[PDB]
Subunit: 336 residues, 3 copies
């Protein structure tokens, strides 16, 4: 169908790690789904010792919000760059076809907005990110990425075509940060975004992140902000990394069904311990919780996770299952 | 079945690169398979110029021994931390469900042991590793990891469901090491394990290993210690990397059937030149040797292999096959 | 069949990014396909500021030319090392079985040549590279790699066995370079290849490339040298990385069908945004262009692409399609 003749619907986005309400399988026909995002440049505290990032965001968050449509829908995004920002921006949707993912049609200087439509003709989780000519990596590594999820119109399916359904979706964006240090060995704090550029590029070129964070800060997804679930609930964990590879893992769990390349027309793999999100992509994993407790969800380069920040928590309520796991003998003195 | 009512069997582990005797397809019903491992902290020489690592091991080796069960069995591990060690330890089985892989139920201080049971309900090769709170990466990168192999009860299968059988299994654990240097440019040698910690963490955070070794040392799997096979033999090569990605390759061979994500309910890929083991996982490859000679088995970042240590040898006996490969003209002067 | 009794054919190679003419599906029976390559050591300018590499090539190019045969053919390569070169060389075909991929049978000192035959019994794209004992990574990272493509005799197939056909093939070799700097912060320029060795090895061991280039130089596949296509054309993009992982992506496009591990007997994945080429392998992607314009084809570590060089262009002619993508509102002032 010609999108000019299709029904339009507007979606209200929600901040990560939540995902806006949506159907999985749907009876709806194709629609033009309208979204708006407003770019916000801001200084963010990214760790527990006060380090700041001169950040750049879609909608005020790292990652930007997840946009969910169904295959055959059209995404119609209004991208707003307020006059309070300093830099030009745009958006490149990996789910889109043509014009550098839309970037060529969405160059917005501060004070401008633009509206792009594209057909979401391929199912999967797809990165979107800013990509202004001449400063693409800087915008991405400063925070400007998120996920478009294009669900099959009949929902997710296993390799045999059986329906998969999730009760809750969470979106995790993992950001490799390149925060400069000065000659005194301390991270630099910059008064403006532009002042951070040259020093950051030099760090970028070392390919060694200073920090690797989920959702904008060390510990973002811990404490009051841990993800939650219950025994018996099936969760979809969407993981995006717009610049650098990562290897997600749920400690004490699995990926029951995983699309690590993120494209739902391909059969998922089952029983994964750790999966692999290629830099420049989003993937997705389903897991049904079977044990209560506080899980970690992390990048299983354990240095990247525990030293650099790429780890969060999932607090799960419910009944312990001794068939799956039992402490036979608690820690005690070695028998003589 | 309730594991409390199942038969128990004890397995005697063997040191890598061998794997303890086991059946592939079995007629046995599910069992509780009992294993014991004893942690050993020790200083190890890891290269040919005398560099030492303040190492930490399961059962005295890097990797720890491979534990083999069948899907539906229960693993019942007694983990022993002798009083001669300095650090607390535990174990996280990626094959297990709950309690941070068992780590929360197996915290053993020196002088203690604990016994954990879990259902091996998912087939595959799975990493196990130590994970003590607050010092997880250090224990892993110091040597505390190995593989649990959970075989399908009817053995390995190809994508069409045809039986695959191996004649011999080898286990290769690849360890990215982070050995500090001092101001004189020499690797440091520490009197105690604890003394190595701060300096090591700083190296870890650079994400650049000093060494990347198979099975505990540069050249571990070479010379008298090369792996062996014969023409006609099918070998299973289990490869674990608990912290960092690797890309195994058999020079002059292939991965005939490879589960690079390591999970046997998924179809394997065939004819691989190089496969990919995500940090935090174990995978497995089958190969049937068709040519004699000394093969290399290595990480195909060739710098990681040849400069940093991630390479071993397989010495294969048998008859050369000129249909597969023939030297038509030996090296000789360029024709005029 | 015994290759000694098969028909022989000679192929004339072409320089990257083109691929020599070949059939996809063929009615031909198996043949011994004869190729010749001549090693050329030479100094190359690799970036826009005059940096040089003491390079080593097959046939004068980075990558070496792509060799195309069909499964069941035999490859019979004459490798020539002219007396004007300084180093010994050989060739390791990942598509071959035995003798370290042929390297043990092809050690040629300057002034020598050798001829190797092997059965191309496995379909896929496979790396070939030089591998002289004691200096393997140096030869590879200095430029000595390319691709052997072994097509199924009936052409490429989708997961259901439907025929895939491409109109044009391009070959992209991605090279992580390790160019030393001196104490003045400038890249070194060496008078001879041998003089570059020690300093290069030290850089290699940092695992941080100075440059990551397609096809021999920053910008090699841009400007007059951009890849080309038309709307409606299906292109096969062969991507080789003999030493280090990469993650190809077509900006504004997709991988319609991708064999990221490069082995055509396995089903491809569809709709990929970004795929993954393990260091030490070649993979292949098909894409049918649906929009005109200048695409980028790049490694989606965007720092590696835009800062270090791993990006090229595809200039595509044809008609813009507003169903796939439309600018609804051009950039304009934010509504009041
Ligand atoms: Cu931006
Ligand atoms: Cu992108
Ligand atoms: Cu430990
Ligand atoms: Cu783990
Ligand atoms: Cu060479
Ligand atoms: Cu190789």
């Amino acid at each position: 169908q010609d999108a000019d003749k299709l029904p339009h619907t507007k979606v209200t986005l929600v901040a990560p790690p939540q995902v806006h309400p949506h159907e999985q399988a749907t009876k709806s026909g194709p629609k033009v789904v309208e979204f708006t995002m407003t770019i916000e440049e801001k200084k963010m505290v990214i760790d527990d010792k006060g380090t700041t990032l001169q950040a750049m965001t879609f909608n005020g968050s790292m990652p930007g919000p997840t946009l969910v449509v169904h295959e055959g829908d059209y995404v119609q995004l209004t991208l707003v760059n307020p006059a309070t920002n300093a830099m030009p921006h745009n958006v490149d949707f990996h789910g889109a076809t043509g014009a550098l993912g839309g970037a060529k049609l969405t160059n917005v200087n501060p004070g401008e907005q633009a509206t792009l439509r594209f057909k979401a003709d391929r199912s999967g989780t797809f990165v979107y990110h800013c990509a202004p000519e001449g400063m693409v990596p800087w915008h991405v590594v400063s925070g400007m990425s998120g996920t478009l999820m294009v669900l099959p119109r009949d929902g997710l399916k296993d390799p045999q075509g059986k329906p998969l359904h999730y009760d809750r979706a969470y979106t995790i964006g993992e950001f490799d940060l390149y925060i400069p240090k000065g000659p005194d060995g301390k991270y630099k704090d910059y008064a403006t975004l532009a002042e951070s550029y040259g020093d950051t590029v030099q760090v970028m070129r070392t390919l060694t992140p200073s920090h690797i964070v989920f959702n904008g800060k060390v510990g973002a997804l811990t404490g009051a902000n841990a993800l939650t679930a219950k025994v018996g609930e099936t969760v979809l964990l969407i993981h995006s990394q717009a610049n650098r590879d990562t290897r997600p893992h749920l400690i004490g769990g699995h990926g029951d069904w995983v699309w690590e390349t993120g494209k739902f027309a391909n059969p998922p793999q089952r029983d994964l311990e750790t999966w692999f999100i290629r830099g420049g992509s989003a993937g997705a994993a389903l897991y049904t919780f079977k044990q209560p407790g506080v899980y970690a969800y992390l990048n299983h380069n354990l240095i990247e996770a525990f030293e650099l920040g790429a780890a969060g928590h999932i607090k799960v309520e419910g009944k312990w299952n001794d068939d799956l796991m039992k402490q036979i003998k608690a820690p005690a003195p070695i028998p003589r």
